[PDB]
Amino acid sequence: AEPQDGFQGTRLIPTGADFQSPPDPFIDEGVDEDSVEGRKVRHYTVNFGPQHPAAHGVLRLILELNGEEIVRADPHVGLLHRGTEKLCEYKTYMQALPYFDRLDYVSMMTNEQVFSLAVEKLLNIEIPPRAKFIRTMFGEITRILNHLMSVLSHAMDVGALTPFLWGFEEREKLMEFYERVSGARLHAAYVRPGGVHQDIPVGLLDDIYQWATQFGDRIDETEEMLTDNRIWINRLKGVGVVSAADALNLSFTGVMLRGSGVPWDVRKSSPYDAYDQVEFDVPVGINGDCYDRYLCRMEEFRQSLRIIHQCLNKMPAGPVRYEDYKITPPPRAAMKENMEALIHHFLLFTKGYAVPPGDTYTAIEAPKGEMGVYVVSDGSERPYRVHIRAPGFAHLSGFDHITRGHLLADAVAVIGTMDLVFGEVDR
Amino acid sequence: VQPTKFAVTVRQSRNWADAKQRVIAAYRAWIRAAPEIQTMYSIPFPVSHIRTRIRQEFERHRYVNKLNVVDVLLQQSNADFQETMNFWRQQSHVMAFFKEEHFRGEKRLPSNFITGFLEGRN
Amino acid sequence: AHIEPMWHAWISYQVDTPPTREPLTQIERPWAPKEHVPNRSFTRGAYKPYNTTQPKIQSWEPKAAPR
Amino acid sequence: TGRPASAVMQAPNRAEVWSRSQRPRSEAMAGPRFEQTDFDAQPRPWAAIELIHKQPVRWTHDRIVACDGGGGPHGHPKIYINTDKPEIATCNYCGLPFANEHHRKYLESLPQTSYPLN
Amino acid sequence: AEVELTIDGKKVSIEAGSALIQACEKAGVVVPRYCYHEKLAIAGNCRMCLVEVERSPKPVASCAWPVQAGMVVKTNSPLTHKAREGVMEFLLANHPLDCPICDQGGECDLQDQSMRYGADRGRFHEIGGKRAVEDKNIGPLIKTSMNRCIHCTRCVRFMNDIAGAPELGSTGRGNDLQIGTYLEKNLDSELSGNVIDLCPVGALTSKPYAFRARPWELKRTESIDVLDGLGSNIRVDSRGLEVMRILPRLNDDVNEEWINDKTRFACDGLKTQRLTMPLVRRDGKFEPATWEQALTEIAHAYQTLAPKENEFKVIAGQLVEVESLVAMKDLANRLGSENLALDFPGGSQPLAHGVDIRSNYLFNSKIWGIEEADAILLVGTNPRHEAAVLNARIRKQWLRSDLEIAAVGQPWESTFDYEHLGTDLAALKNALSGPFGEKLKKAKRPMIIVGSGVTEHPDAKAFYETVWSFVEKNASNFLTEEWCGYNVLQRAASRAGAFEVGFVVPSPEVAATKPKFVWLLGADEFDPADVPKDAFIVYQGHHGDRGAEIADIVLPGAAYTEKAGTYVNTEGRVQMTRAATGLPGAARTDWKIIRAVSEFLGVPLPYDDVAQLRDRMAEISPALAAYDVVEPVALRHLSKVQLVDQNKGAKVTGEPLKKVVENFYFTDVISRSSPTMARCSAAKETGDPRTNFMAPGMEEDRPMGQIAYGA
Amino acid sequence: PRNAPDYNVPIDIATSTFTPVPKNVQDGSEENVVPAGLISGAPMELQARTVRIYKPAKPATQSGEKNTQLWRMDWDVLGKGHRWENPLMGWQSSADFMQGTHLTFKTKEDAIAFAEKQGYEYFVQEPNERHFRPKAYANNFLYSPGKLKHIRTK
């Protein structure tokens, strides 16, 4: 009878240390004196951060060092915890969507994809084919955008500075497509429950194809500088090595999961949007190290480009927005001409749409790993509880287990191979 | 203390003899540490003022007769001890525990009826 | 901020027709500004906000009756 | 404050307030913040109320007239105005004047009218 | 009896003779409606309640379909679904696209039930256009945007049946049918503002609350009306520190979904002439002062006078809560004074009814007792002006039953037929023994309502023993186990509470002593003879009115919208107001002003938290601890000793019973400060139907407009 | 001592010039109730202010009753600190940290249990319900043997 039976402490909660079991004695794999062996060694602590690159903006990781090697790594996060999950309870569902742009701020339209897919699942609606392809095309444009940040900032930390500038022109060109569909270079707010906010402009699919014709040459020259370079190879081989069993036990997803030899992509295993309609491959590494995770990320550049070209050729016609004004806003022209449309316009922008009661956990294959949201609905127009599962939050939690015994110059390489934007980690 | 210097695995008091043993060991560590807290955080108070103020924070929960309530009050103490003994709390958090470094000071509720009436509820 | 607004769209590749052939600039608007005012911060002409509404509660204007 | 005319006159076109809860610029731009200040640089838009009443009446032979604001989908929601009272009927969204041709004789005989009427 | 039936499978137990929509409500089933209102007659015009009934080829209107012993009702069948979409398509075909400019936006039943039972898009695109209708001038309070009318008939039913004001109608035919007086007229009814709440759509809106707020931005507080003695339950909607509007909340025991116009529009008088700082009269001019040195000059003046027993006098106004009565009662007692007067004339002398038995001064057959009244005698009361919502409840019973009403007093313009017996006391003695008396003697549940306006009549002692001696002569009909035909009707929200705590003059001796010091505690309707000119006057209140004009000190208290005061309504129900906003300026809670001046005069009243002051109120009267309930009077027969025994030798003078309400619009200080009541009086007087009568808007003689509201 | 405000309560960091003086602060000893306000980390001011537990009344403006179905717990407004006018923009400033917070509960006893668990002062308001009365369309056309005393107009 908790909490009443807990007043006197008549019951003790069975801790995991109660259910510990001795290892089997037979098949089990592997003091004080005048000598200096008994002598102890002092350690000193070091305050690492903030580094120059934008993604690792608020990292205060405190390392304990035995000489040069890392004994224990304690990241202190929360320096960009802004209370998103609470502010989302006082907003309608449409009002809460811009909060998702600002979680992983280098992968915006895939953050708002997982929130739309979660709300759409509770709405029990099927979004039209055109928005399905628009979302899968701009989800791969987003994946290229994030990898341009992640791979090139990683090599900028490792000390290669030129690939960073080349691919940020490629980034500079691919944000023109964000600003044409929406009016934002960073926070589009374009992907919304029921499809997309507005139809793509009438010359964009030609301009993406023109960009497509040359983007592989950009990967090849970026690959000219890093892949076979012995300095690059000797700074990532054997660094940050995680076993396949431990990556699962550590809650690793994405290339952190995939670089240790586990074939697993949410797009292939729980297909969403138009991913079941596109042919693409999944790079899976061997040795579980930073060099494998670099080679897996470069291969995804070429695979995302291969999806974008397929999306251009299968772009169907029709609404880009769920054809129901109780859920998605009516056209401006309808609202200014038809009675029912102005009523549905008015109520969607003041009260919002009601979501039926229930809860759903929805995950997508985000560029930094698996990104998921747990949404409790109360049947009303505001979410009762929004919880974001951020791939980097679980990755930074396993930084101590992975950097243990490494050098600090090794740990800076481990920070970049884990795709870490701290607005994602702190929500 | 495996992951951090002052870490203590979360434990559930077995009975009142155990629960009082832990409280006294918590109080002992805090008042032991008061000289170390007063130099790191440059507290412009006597170590005696720090110790008498540490005592007040235990004196608040002296009448708790629930064993489930003591463990959460003990875990809160242990966590506060860990973030103070590691230089994780800023001087601003620590010397903000002393409720006289407000520009209104310790006197922040009205003293009686009339003085709070003439000041509009303080 | 010295660029006049309709030319600002041209210089930004937001239109292809310059304001020299765009009919939208040939609308007569007597309220429209006569000269181009640039960004006027950092100067004594900087914009100063104020309340536009009246005070909410009107107080009694004391009138003592004669004795 | 006070000395410049822009600090004193509520709008360039109008001198007085046009709602009961509007603050006069004389009282809004008094105080310390408006010292060492250029009042001719201050934002002072033309008052819409004066401009709308300079609008000529649309004469019509119909009982119900339709107003969409005058720009197709660039106006306001299309509504319908009844012009059966011997007055000038005005669109609730934009303020434009409408009047039935039957009331032209009466309307032309009034001394002061809320719209130019020609 | 009870029929049983199934609606969507589930059995509901509803009385025979009720409509299906009533059983659908009881069964937990939501049925869309526009025309049907629980408190209005059934009309089957909207067609939004069409449900599928077994053994019926057509959909039936559930609102008008009586429940039968075995029927089956499907409310979610495909018959029902296409019925509701078809009606929602018709209701929106000619509806104006005026939701951004409509005041009903965000709280509209047409919008919500279009979102829930209609189609998502519309199929009306006629080049011929929509219907459009001209606006109608029906008085100052109501603004009309008639294009929005959906022809529910809710307001014509309310105005014709509840308000008894049959000037609203429905002229025309077909699509050109229109709601409004054919010839422009000012709707003359103290209940007319209820039409605005009843309207499903914004075709009837309030001119004061014209475009100021959206419903979503309003904080809602459930409080009490104190502008009358009935204690009507309301909702105070406020945006920050300004009250926006006052709406009616349901309480079938008191006001039943209805409020009068005074209690709905006087809230603009809460931001106009407020006392916000202490004032001291210096050289004939009121100077601002602080609290520490206005309470000081209270004490210094009191020490200088050194008043004797009962020389310190209090007069309690008509908006005063019970907490400050008990506190001022104490501070009065510690000063040797029992001089506890009341605002009305005759309130500084003892009252003809006592305060010893609670049943002496209460509406004993509670407000709900009218619902079964058979004969009613009204004595000294124009109930249409003194208690508007109560007056409506009398007419509702009259219109549906064989109710006989007779009145002794001044004839008034009544919404129900009544026999007029006379105007003076003899015309009561001659009536009570005349033909109408046997109606009271014969009819079960008889009801005699004695207006609080006779308490101030000089002959009240004779009036009150005349009434009760008839009641005592006619018990077992007037004084049964569950009935009491004796009822005294308060018109100010403070009187029943003052009587409950004994805040009255006890004896003629204390009444004749001249005071040197008068505390006008929110008192503004005092007779000049009850305040000696040379006395020292403290005014404690919230509005600058007559009371502050004569004060030597002015102390700003709180209005009823920013205090949680206790009030007792005329039936004896103890209700609590909820503060909707905070105190303006330097005002202070009223009971706290008393408690502080206890320190400055050296007799500090013990309690210094309001919880303690409610414990003290419990000692004076335990009923004051019971909230939202009437406590029945046990010794109801003991009332003879005050009404008849202590009223035996009465000096009858023969003066006729007087009207108490010269202006229904100008009764209190909140009302008199209200611009909206200013327009209501001026429109009443000059008979102006124009909505923009002293308001913003274009006119024939204002082509240019006007920014004055209320002038 | 019988509703006496403990003027000597030890304040905390969030205590202000708007915090009222409490009467009772959860000691952690009261029987059958968890002293959640003692271990919540909330300020002492939560234990001084009263909350109202009530069922919201249906709007007079409309006939939907969805919002009347659940009990709401909200904090009472104080005489100072709830709203004041911003001198600069005319906005409404506040010191009341509870002004926009409300709680929803399925039953009255669920709200009372939470209030006592947190040490709130609470006033419960009992719902106002209707009085059932059979309504019949047929009455609109009942026959009057005598004077009409009413001209029904649909």
Ligand SMILES: *P(=O)(O)OCC(C)(C)[C@H](O)C(=O)NCCC(=O)NCCSC(=O)CCCCCCCCCCCCC
């Ligand atoms: P004695 O037998 O009289 O008393 C012994 C005790 C107190 C155990 C009682 O017998 C008892 O049973 N009391 C109830 C149990 C109890 O005390 N529960 C709570 C214990 S934990 C606690 O009180 C934590 C207090 C706060 C800890 C931190 C204090 C210092 C923080 C700030 C320092 C200065 C700034 C850095």
Ligand code: SF4
């Ligand atoms: S009445 Fe309702 S539906 Fe009609 S315009 Fe107003 S808000 Fe819209």
Ligand code: SF4
């Ligand atoms: S004015 Fe309003 S209440 Fe009256 S009939 Fe029209 S819609 Fe119904």
Ligand code: FES
């Ligand atoms: S609800 Fe029965 S027809 Fe309107």
Ligand SMILES: [Zn+2]
């Ligand atoms: Zn228009």
